[PDB]
Amino acid sequence: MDRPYRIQEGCFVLPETFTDRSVNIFILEGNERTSPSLNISRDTLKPDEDLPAYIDRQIALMKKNLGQHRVLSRAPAQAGTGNDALMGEQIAATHKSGKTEVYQRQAGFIATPGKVLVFTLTSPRPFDDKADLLWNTWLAGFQPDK
């Protein structure tokens, strides 16, 4: 059968057999330099895999597929505020793309049983106060569907 699916522009019906692999991408306008961009992706937990193990597997995937992937920090993260906020984990990490070092924050949360929601910020240069505030303002304003 067909189930509802919601996007910014409206809703439609999707056969329940389809897995959602949508990647949201938000391009922001720069000032003097190129601006960080934002991204939301999805994943499925393996059987008996908890979030820390999932994050480990993702770090390994980044190392296998990218150049010079380097974890700079790993810590708890929170999506939203109040009773419905999601508790998860985040990293900050760099990698090399051609001649340039790319900076990313990536946070994972179990939104529903077995389902991971990932929030990513990507910058072509080191984080600054503006980029950090964007990250925390974005995560804090997420309102999970109840």
Partner: protein, 50 residues
């Protein structure tokens, strides 16, 4: 100039067409369409037409 941070032609029909063929023809696309690697999906897409 980098499509990860700027508007580009990787949009609309073009990206829709690339995504479909990639799912079928490129095993690596399963990794760039989920989890942490999906953060760089547009970089992967650009490489498929360069």
């Amino acid at each position: 100039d980098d499509p990860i941070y700027h508007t580009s032609a990787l949009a609309g029909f073009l990206i829709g067409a690339i995504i479909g063929i990639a799912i079928i023809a490129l095993a690596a696309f399963a990794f760039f369409s989920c989890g942490f690697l999906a953060g760089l999906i547009l970089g992967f897409m650009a490489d498929q037409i360069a």
